[PDB]
Design a protein around this ligand. Structure first.
Ligand SMILES: Nc1ncnc2c1ncn2[C@@H]1O[C@H](CSCC[C@H](N)C(=O)O)[C@@H](O)[C@H]1O
Length: 228
């Protein structure tokens, strides 16, 4: 699993103590309630086995005027269709297999999904614990391009950057497991304060402003909310 496609990542830190400081009223606190805008469209990048996506859907409190549709994508197809067969809400969550660092696949599938509601772009994006894997697999330039695509693809963006602590463990686990091919740990110049580095990249470069954060940047894991 070089892209970090660990089966059932949910055994690793539980959904509940990654959203305990996340307000359930977030969907109420971010979007108007006029139904003319249509459903609230979320893009969950990196839905390992649907656990955290289902938990995010069950966690947010609805508006009772619009409905929350969530397109979740992942690079491992077996994991995606497991998430499909394990998923409580069929008519609310749509699972697809996508390598987000592929222009053609991403453009085609994301326009196929958003054509169903008009929706030139998404409403809210979810980038939970995928930053480090995009980084390790495509260098600083791939992290930059990933954040750029998500900034120009979403109105709001809830990123969970993995700290530099996890980088060492992941790089060791990949180097020893005959997979140092999917690892640029040496050539990474963006380092140390991954939350603040993501903040600076999404702020100076991609026209987004940090409007919320739940957790400390020096904590276990911090959640960071940007808006275009
Ligand atoms: N280029 C890429 N495009 C899409 N998904 C990717 C990707 N690289 C990695 N992923 C997916 O991103 C996930 C990161 S693991 C995090 C799982 C989930 N976000 C959670 O926090 O519970 C992995 O399951 C992997 O399958």
């Amino acid at each position: 699993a070089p892209f970090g496609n660990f089966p059932h990542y949910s055994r690793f830190h539980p959904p509940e103590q990654r959203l305990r400081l996340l307000p359930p009223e977030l969907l109420r606190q971010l979007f108007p309630e006029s139904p003319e805008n249509g459903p609230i469209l979320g893009l969950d990048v990196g839905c390992n086995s649907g656990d955290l996506s289902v938990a995010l859907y069950k966690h947010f409190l609805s508006l009772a005027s619009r409905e929350f549709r969530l397109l979740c994508c992942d690079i491992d197809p077996v994991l995606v269709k497991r998430a499909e067969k394990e998923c409580p809400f069929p008519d609310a969550l749509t699972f697809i297999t996508l390598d987000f660092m592929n222009q053609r696949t991403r453009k085609v599938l994301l326009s196929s999904f958003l054509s169903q509601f008009g929706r030139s772009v998404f409403d809210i994006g979810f980038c939970m614990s995928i930053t480090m894997w995009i980084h390790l697999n495509h260098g600083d330039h791939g992290l930059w391009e990933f954040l750029a695509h998500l900034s120009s693809l979403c109105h709001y963006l809830l990123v969970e950057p993995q700290p530099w602590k996890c980088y060492r463990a992941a790089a060791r686990r990949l180097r020893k497991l005959g997979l140092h091919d999917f690892d640029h740990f040496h050539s990474l110049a963006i380092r140390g304060d991954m939350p603040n580095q993501i903040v600076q990249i999404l702020t100076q470069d991609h026209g987004m402003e940090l409007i919320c954060c739940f957790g400390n940047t020096s904590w276990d894991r911090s959640l960071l909310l940007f808006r275009a």
